[PDB]
Structure formats: structure tokens, C-alpha cells
Amino acid sequence: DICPASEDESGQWKNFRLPDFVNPVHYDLHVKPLLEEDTYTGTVSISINLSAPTRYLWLHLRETRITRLPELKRPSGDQVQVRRCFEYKKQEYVVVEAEEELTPSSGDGLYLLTMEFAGWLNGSLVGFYRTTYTENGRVKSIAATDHEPTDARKSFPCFDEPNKKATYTISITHPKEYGALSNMPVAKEESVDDKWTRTTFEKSVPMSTYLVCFAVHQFDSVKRISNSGKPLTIYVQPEQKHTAEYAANITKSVFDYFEEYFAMNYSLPKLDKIAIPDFGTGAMENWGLITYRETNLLYDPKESASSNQQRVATVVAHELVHQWFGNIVTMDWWEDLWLNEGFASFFEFLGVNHAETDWQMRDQMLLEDVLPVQEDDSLMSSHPIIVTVTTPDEITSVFDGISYSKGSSILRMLEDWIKPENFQKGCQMYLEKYQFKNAKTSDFWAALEEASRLPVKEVMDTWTRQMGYPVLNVNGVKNITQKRFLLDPRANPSQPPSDLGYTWNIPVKWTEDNITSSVLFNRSEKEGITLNSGNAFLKINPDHIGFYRVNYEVATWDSIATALSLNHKTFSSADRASLIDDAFALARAQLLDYKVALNLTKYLKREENFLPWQRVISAVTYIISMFEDDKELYPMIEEYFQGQVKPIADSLGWNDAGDHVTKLLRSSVLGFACKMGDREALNNASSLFEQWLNGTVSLPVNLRLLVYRYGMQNSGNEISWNYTLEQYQKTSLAQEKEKLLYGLASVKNVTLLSRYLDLLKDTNLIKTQDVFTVIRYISYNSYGKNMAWNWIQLNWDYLVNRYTLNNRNLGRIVTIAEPFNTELQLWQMESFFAKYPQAGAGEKPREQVLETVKNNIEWLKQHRNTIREWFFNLL
Numbered sequence: 001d002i003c004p005a006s007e008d009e010s011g012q013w014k015n016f017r018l019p020d021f022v023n024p025v026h027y028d029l030h031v032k033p034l035l036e037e038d039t040y041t042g043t044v045s046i047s048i049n050l051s052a053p054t055r056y057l058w059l060h061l062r063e064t065r066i067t068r069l070p071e072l073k074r075p076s077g078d079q080v081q082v083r084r085c086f087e088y089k090k091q092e093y094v095v096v097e098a099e100e101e102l103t104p105s106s107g108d109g110l111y112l113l114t115m116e117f118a119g120w121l122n123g124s125l126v127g128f129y130r131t132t133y134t135e136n137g138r139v140k141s142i143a144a145t146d147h148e149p150t151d152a153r154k155s156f157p158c159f160d161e162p163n164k165k166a167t168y169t170i171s172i173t174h175p176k177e178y179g180a181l182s183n184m185p186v187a188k189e190e191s192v193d194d195k196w197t198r199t200t201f202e203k204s205v206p207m208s209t210y211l212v213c214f215a216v217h218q219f220d221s222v223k224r225i226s227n228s229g230k231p232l233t234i235y236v237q238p239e240q241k242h243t244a245e246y247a248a249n250i251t252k253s254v255f256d257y258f259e260e261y262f263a264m265n266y267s268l269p270k271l272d273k274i275a276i277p278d279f280g281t282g283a284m285e286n287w288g289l290i291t292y293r294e295t296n297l298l299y300d301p302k303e304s305a306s307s308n309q310q311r312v313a314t315v316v317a318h319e320l321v322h323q324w325f326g327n328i329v330t331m332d333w334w335e336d337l338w339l340n341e342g343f344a345s346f347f348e349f350l351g352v353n354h355a356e357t358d359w360q361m362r363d364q365m366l367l368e369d370v371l372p373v374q375e376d377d378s379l380m381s382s383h384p385i386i387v388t389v390t391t392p393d394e395i396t397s398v399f400d401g402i403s404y405s406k407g408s409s410i411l412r413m414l415e416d417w418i419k420p421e422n423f424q425k426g427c428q429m430y431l432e433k434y435q436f437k438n439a440k441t442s443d444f445w446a447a448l449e450e451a452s453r454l455p456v457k458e459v460m461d462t463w464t465r466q467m468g469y470p471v472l473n474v475n476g477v478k479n480i481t482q483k484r485f486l487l488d489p490r491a492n493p494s495q496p497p498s499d500l501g502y503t504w505n506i507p508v509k510w511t512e513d514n515i516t517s518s519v520l521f522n523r524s525e526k527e528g529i530t531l532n533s534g535n536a537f538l539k540i541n542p543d544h545i546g547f548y549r550v551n552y553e554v555a556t557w558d559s560i561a562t563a564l565s566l567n568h569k570t571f572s573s574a575d576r577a578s579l580i581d582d583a584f585a586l587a588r589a590q591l592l593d594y595k596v597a598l599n600l601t602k603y604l605k606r607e608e609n610f611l612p613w614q615r616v617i618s619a620v621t622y623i624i625s626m627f628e629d630d631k632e633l634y635p636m637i638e639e640y641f642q643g644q645v646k647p648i649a650d651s652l653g654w655n656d657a658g659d660h661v662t663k664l665l666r667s668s669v670l671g672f673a674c675k676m677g678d679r680e681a682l683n684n685a686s687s688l689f690e691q692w693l694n695g696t697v698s699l700p701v702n703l704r705l706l707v708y709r710y711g712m713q714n715s716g717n718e719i720s721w722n723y724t725l726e727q728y729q730k731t732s733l734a735q736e737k738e739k740l741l742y743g744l745a746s747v748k749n750v751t752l753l754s755r756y757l758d759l760l761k762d763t764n765l766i767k768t769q770d771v772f773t774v775i776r777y778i779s780y781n782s783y784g785k786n787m788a789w790n791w792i793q794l795n796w797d798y799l800v801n802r803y804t805l806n807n808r809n810l811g812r813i814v815t816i817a818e819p820f821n822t823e824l825q826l827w828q829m830e831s832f833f834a835k836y837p838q839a840g841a842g843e844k845p846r847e848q849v850l851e852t853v854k855n856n857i858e859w860l861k862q863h864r865n866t867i868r869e870w871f872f873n874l875l
């Protein structure tokens, strides 16, 4: 209509990327929501630094429409003739053509552009939107924004690139029953009617568009004060006020820890946290207004698990890290996203480590990031940390294991190598140098290279400009050689083409008899190096500190198995987990015989630590998974591993006792017991479940999930399913809801799972934020593995229409096919993919799950007999 679409390419707006010569300085943004109508309007005025002759000005806009022909101002202050406005859909631009070109802003004078826009609050979790909740029987509303990475442009027209930093003064006209929040504190409130209020916020510091946030709400607040004297407050529904307490404690403690560690003041006068009742990601670091999904913020000590406690603490820590890395210093372009996410993923563990001293957090990095992503990054369809992105779908896709976990892992290695004290100072100098501007990876190296004089750029580039990682092959006890580690032995190790040729500069640490030594393994040492007396055993890569795997000689591996059987405590908890993790990965990759790997599990009846058990359970889950339908192998593996956990499972018992890590251990260990078919563990679950159904007995917090899952699995029926469904509706605590959803996915009943799948289309029952979680839970169920898979196929058009191909969670949902392991199942996947070839943000996940399923097929072919032999001979 006004500002209509045109297929005109002849101009610089055909470029995916914005021009270098147009730069915003300041945004004047006003929005007015019609909450009950699911609509809003706004005007935005943008001051523009023009650097080159141009007849056109363009910026990002999606879905939201322009309603008034835009208005441009010369730097002197005069009004500029405008011929046309038009939308260019292909690159999400709205363009305006001036009558006849104009002139760079040479002085302190700037162009001013004003646009009138109207958008929707319904049918979406990005941009500016409204959702509801219930309070004392009344349906209440809350409106908020979510922009990362390319959704600012849905909320309001803007220069929607992270490096187009500008300053912000936002105002909102809302009904008076409501408050309004944004990045900055309130400046002034003025009555429009006796019904409407206009809330104006004070001028922001320069910040990227994706960080710009506002909300209209009727939430209560829980308050805290930083050591700086700034108010740190969490907004929360009155009924849920008590559950905001913990997040308040951790925000205070971690805010205070960080401001000191980074040697830099938090840039805003206040900081707010709020959980939107329906929220599309886990949390979002909007400067001064961090938004949450309830499960990641709201915690009840009387009802929530230790798992939940640690999650809340970590996400809060995480989002707080961004207030420095991401907010103050932002990446120049999304290819450098890890500068944000890896740093947050790394420092989160230090944040919470300060707050909660006996959580062994620094160790837990191995379980949360390091070892999981070493699985991910051993695929051909991984990608380097520095990622080429050319579409919004490509950009959103890279919020993934690589940016977060490998980012986190290579910082962990870097810190240990360069040493913490110097890593600290180097991050500090990087922070003061690039404050309120944008950095590239190159800059962070140079920053740390000024801090250690060590070769940081030379060494870290190898870890960063190519995908994958090495396995160190041990020859003798002491000679090591490096080689790319790929899970698929048939894959071509030189692909895709890398300038660095898939060799790394590896910082290598090893323990000789309780004494530790260091070496940097140069890329150019083509025929390996020797590790610098009188030695019988050499412990390489202690605590799995380096982002690599170590393949000892078979003789050594054998000797490690025996040493574990005799006195496992000889190795640290981490070293055990790491040795077990490498061996099973090496076996998977056909680099070590499975008999050798399995032999390392023999000691387990005496295993008592969290870390080794976690990585054991991870490795076994996969093997068990591949033989699910093998009536010959399965009972044997079940029987074995049942026997290996039984003592620890019995020792810990079905009761909440012990410190944090013990409580976590009991969870995974009792769950594995149940998974492995321990009659007595299953009976504990059923018994507790039956009691829970009696309506009063509040289950031990760290056992609930297991009780709902295995209780429903073993004794669930329509009566208890219906009851569980009601309970899920009735409870206010999102953390409990999510457990109950997992419970409901556990029923061994096709009819009930079918009803459950149908509920996904009902927004009164399942929130939009939870659809993918539920699909994923159902896929874990022995019937539902195929039910969820079939349902996403039948309902693909429906999902795409509801979420759009740009939604990452929709892109990722095909990973429910990870357990598939037959040529039949692979053919199904490929057929579905060929029928719906427009994959959007699902393009990478598709590649990844396909590789995995192919690997599974090969794996079964290579290893069935060997694994069978090992189990048969033992039992």
C-alpha cells in the first residue's frame, strides 16, 4: 500500500549487508501498544551520519509496516523532498528515495529521519509481543521485546546490525494500570488521558539494536542493592514473588564478583530482571533489562531441584557476563559471535563458583561444555568458531555448541596456558580498549598478546579459523603425534579446505609423578615432538584442560584399566572422566578397540564421584541406544551396567541428603539404575509415584523428575495421566511444570501420547515456548521416538507457518532423529528433507543429524560382534 514492495535490484540495497557510509547516532523511539487489540503503533526519529553521495536511504524492517510517508531532515535542519518509499523484501529493507541526492555530515550536524509504523503483538515470540497469565482468576497481560539476532527490525525500523551502535531514548504510551520498563531508568511520567500514561526513559549509552528492550507489565518486584549502590531488582508475578529470592541473591553476589574481576563499572544506573510467561529463548542479556524464561530464573527451595538451582545460578551468571562481553564490547559481525557467547559460557562458571563455593563448578565445565562439544566438533558438518554467515537464517543458526561450548573450552585452555592472572589482565585491557565499540577476534588476541608476550595469535588462530580438533597419538611412553579426530573413519580429513591444513599449535600439559610440565606443540613439527626423569607412566592433558584427545598405546590403556580396578583414586575425579571419555570416543571412531574401552568400566562398582559417572552414563547411553532393538546384546549390557551402578545407587538411596554434588550424583545414578532396569530402583519410583498420586505427599526435590518419569512409565494409566495433566495446569512453578511434562511424555500408551501431541496445537494448554521441549520428551519414549518424528512430518507446514523458517528451535527439532541407525530410517529422513528442501535455520542441524545417522549405521556394522564378544565372554 504505502511504502509498497518492489523487485528493484539496481541500488546498494540489493546488498545483504548495510552500506559503510550510513551511520546512526541517536534513536528517538515512541511506541503505543493497544494491549487488548494485539497491535501497536510508533514513530521513530533517527539521526544519521552520511558519508557519501546517495539518492537513497535504507534500513531494516520486517512484518511491521510503514503507515506514513517518511520524513527526512538536512543537517542544517531543513526538510528534504522524498519521491518514494519502497520495501525490498529479499534483504528485509525499507528504502526511501530522495528527489536528488545529498551531502555527507561534515560537521556536528546530522540528517534526521522520521517514520510511522504499525505492527502486531500476536502470533509470535520475537519483536514486540504480548502474552498472558492468570492471577486470582483474571487473565492479565504483559508485553515485551526480544530481538537477537535480527528481530529488532520487527519491533521498529532500524539499522539492525550489531556494529551500528547508537544511543537510545525510548518512550512508551501505555494504560496507567501498567508500568513500563526499558534499558535505562525512568526519566519522567506524564498523563495523556486519565487512562493513559507516557513513560519516557533517560538517554542510553551507545548500544547495538539487538540489545534494545522494553516491557509493559503489572509485576511485583524483589529488590537488592549492589556494592556500587545501584538497584538490582527482579520483577515477578505476585503469586510467584517468593521464588524470585534466589535469583536476587545470585544477581547481587555475581554482579559484585564480576565488576571487580573485570575491573570495570557496569555502565548503567540500574539493572532489571524479568521472566516473560511465554519466552522464546532461555534468557536475553538486554542491557539493564535481562529477560528470562521462568525455568531459568524462578526457583523454590521447597519444590525445585539442585539441578534447577544450578541452572538459575548459571543463566543469571551467564547473562551478567554479557553486561561486559556483548554489551560494552560487542562483536563487529556475527561471524565473531563467540566473543559474546563463549566468554559468557566461560565466565559463568567463575561467577557461580564465587556465589556457591562447594559446587565444584570449574570441574563441571567438563560435563557442561568441554566433553559434549568434543562430540559435536568431531563431525564433518561442524564449523569453525569464526563462521561465515550471509543470511538471517545462517546468523541465527550459529547460536550453537561451537560458539558457546568450544568458545568456552578454548578460553579454558587459553587461561591455563597463559595463566589466570595474565588472562584476567588481558581481558581487562580488551574491555577498556573497545568499550562502547566493536571488536574482531584479531583484537582479543592482540589484547592478550600485550598481556603475556606469548604467541597468542599464532596459536589460537589454529583453534579458531578451522573446525575440528586433534587426537594426540602416543608412541613409546613419550613421543606424541597429532592428527585430526573425526568420528567417521571413512571421512576425508582434509575437507573442507583449510589454510591451516588441520594441524594445530597445541598447548600441552602433562603430569609426571604428581609434578606438572608444559610444552607448546608447533604445527611445523610435522613428525611430532617428545615430552621432556626415569619414567613408567605419563598422564597427558590433566583435567582434560586442552581441547584434544589422547590416544595412549594399547598397553598403557590396559594398564590404566588394571590401575582403576586396584585403586581408582590414583586418578583425580576429572582425569577418570576424561580417560573414560576419550577411550569411548576413540572406540566410536575406530581408533581404539572397544574391548580396551569397555575394560575401563570394570572398576565402576567402587566408583563414587559425579564426574566419572556422568561421562560413563553418557558413553553407555549411546551404546545402549544403538542396541535398543537387539534382543541378543541388550539384556547383556543392561545386566552388566545394572550391576555396575547398583552399589552407588543403593549407597546413596532414595532420599535428599548430602551436599550439592552428591545430590546431583544421586539423580543421575538412580536414573541410570532405572534406565538399566533395576527392579528395586523402578519399584522405588512406582511407590513414590503412587504416593504422589494420593495428593499430599510432596516428593523429595531431587527425585521428582525420576519419579514422574519412571513412575508414569511403569504404572501410568489414563487416570494418573489425566491427574498429572491437571497438576501441570495447577502448579505456578515453571520448573515443576516442565518435570510434569516429562512425566506425561513417559506413559507407555499410544492413545495418550496421541492426545498429548494434539495438545501442542492448543495454546491454552502448552505454551509456544514449550512446544519443542515436549516434542523432544515424546521422542525419548520408546513408542514416541517414532510418534514425534511422524508428527513433525505430518505437521511441518503448520510448524513453519507458526514459527517461521528463521526460528532456530524449529530448525533444531530434526535432531530428534539422532538415535536413528538403519538405512530405512535414513531413507525416511532424506525423503522428508527432499520434500521440504527449504530448511531455513534448520540447514545445519539437517546436515548434522544426517551425518550422525550415517555414522550410526556404520557403527553397528563395524562393532556389533566385538561388543557382543566382550559382553558374552564376561557374563
Ligand SMILES: *[C@@H]1O[C@H](CO)[C@@H](O[C@@H]2O[C@H](CO)[C@@H](O[C@@H]3O[C@H](CO)[C@@H](O)[C@H](O)[C@H]3NC(C)=O)[C@H](O)[C@H]2NC(C)=O)[C@H](O)[C@H]1NC(C)=O
Pocket: 649, 650, 654, 680, 681, 683, 684, 687
Ligand atoms: C528401593 O530400593 C532398595 C534398594 O536400593 C530396596 O531395598 C533392598 O531390598 C532388597 C530386597 O528386599 C534387599 O535385598 C537383600 O540384600 C541382602 C544383602 O545385604 C541379602 O542378604 C538378602 O538376601 C536380600 N533379600 C532377601 C529377600 O533375602 C536389600 O538389602 C534392601 N536394602 C538396601 C539398602 O539395598 C527397597 O526395597 C526399594 N524400595 C521399594 C519400595 O521397592
Ligand SMILES: *[C@@H]1O[C@H](CO)[C@@H](O[C@@H]2O[C@H](CO)[C@@H](O[C@@H]3O[C@H](CO)[C@@H](O)[C@H](O)[C@H]3NC(C)=O)[C@H](O)[C@H]2NC(C)=O)[C@H](O)[C@H]1NC(C)=O
Pocket: 558, 561, 562, 595, 596, 599, 602, 869, 870, 872, 873, 874, 875
Ligand atoms: C580386556 O578385554 C579382554 C577381551 O575381552 C579381556 O580378555 C578376556 O577375558 C575373559 C575373562 O573374563 C575371557 O573370557 C572367556 O572366554 C572363553 C572363550 O574363549 C570362555 O570359555 C570363558 O568362559 C570366558 N570367561 C568367562 C568368565 O565367561 C577371554 O578369554 C579373554 N579374551 C581374550 C581375547 O583374551 C581382558 O581380561 C581385559 N583386560 C583387562 C580387564 O585388563
Ligand SMILES: *[C@@H]1O[C@H](CO)[C@@H](O[C@@H]2O[C@H](CO)[C@@H](O)[C@H](O)[C@H]2NC(C)=O)[C@H](O)[C@H]1NC(C)=O
Pocket: 038, 120, 122, 123, 124
Ligand atoms: C495477528 O492477528 C491478525 C488479525 O487477526 C492477523 O492478520 C490476519 O491474517 C489472516 C491471514 O493470515 C487474514 O485472513 C486476516 O484478514 C488478517 N487480519 C488483519 C486485520 O490483518 C495477523 O496475521 C496475526 N499476526 C501473526 C504474526 O500471526
Ligand SMILES: *[C@@H]1O[C@H](CO)[C@@H](O[C@@H]2O[C@H](CO)[C@@H](O)[C@H](O)[C@H]2NC(C)=O)[C@H](O)[C@H]1NC(C)=O
Pocket: 245, 246, 247, 249, 301
Ligand atoms: C538469600 O540470602 C539470605 C541471607 O543473605 C539467605 O539466608 C536466609 O536468612 C537467614 C538470615 O540471614 C538465614 O539464617 C536463613 O538460613 C535463610 N533462610 C530463611 C528462610 O530465612 C537466603 O537463604 C538466601 N535466599 C535463597 C537461598 O533463596
Ligand SMILES: *[C@@H]1O[C@H](CO)[C@@H](O[C@@H]2O[C@H](CO)[C@@H](O)[C@H](O)[C@H]2NC(C)=O)[C@H](O)[C@H]1NC(C)=O
Pocket: 718, 719, 722, 755
Ligand atoms: C481423561 O481426560 C480426557 C480429556 O479431558 C477425558 O475426556 C474425553 O476425551 C475424548 C478426547 O480425548 C473426548 O472425545 C471425550 O468426549 C472426552 N470425554 C468427556 C468430555 O466426557 C477422558 O474421559 C478422561 N478419562 C478419565 C478416565 O478420566
Ligand SMILES: *[C@@H]1O[C@H](CO)[C@@H](O[C@@H]2O[C@H](CO)[C@@H](O)[C@H](O)[C@H]2NC(C)=O)[C@H](O)[C@H]1NC(C)=O
Pocket: 718, 748, 749, 750, 751, 752
Ligand atoms: C491406553 O490408554 C487407553 C485410554 O484409556 C486405554 O483404552 C481404554 O481401555 C479401558 C479398558 O480396556 C477402557 O475402559 C476404556 O474405554 C479405553 N479408553 C479409550 C479411550 O479407548 C488402553 O487400554 C491403553 N492401552 C495400553 C496398551 O495400555
Ligand SMILES: CC(C)C[C@H](NC(=O)[C@@H](O)[C@H](N)Cc1ccccc1)C(=O)O
Pocket: 148, 149, 281, 282, 283, 284, 285, 314, 315, 318, 319, 322, 341, 399, 404, 808
Ligand atoms: C545460559 C545460556 C546458555 C542461556 C541461553 N541464553 C543466551 O545464550 C543468551 O545470552 C542469548 N543472547 C539469547 C539467544 C539465544 C539463542 C538465539 C538468539 C539469542 C539460552 O538458552 O537462551
Ligand SMILES: *[C@@H]1O[C@H](CO)[C@@H](O)[C@H](O)[C@H]1NC(C)=O
Pocket: 228, 265
Ligand atoms: C566507577 O566505580 C568507582 C568505584 O565503585 C566509582 O567511584 C566511580 O564513580 C565509577 N566511575 C564512573 C561512574 O564514571
Ligand SMILES: [Zn+2]
Pocket: 318, 319, 322, 340, 341, 344
Ligand atoms: Zn549468552
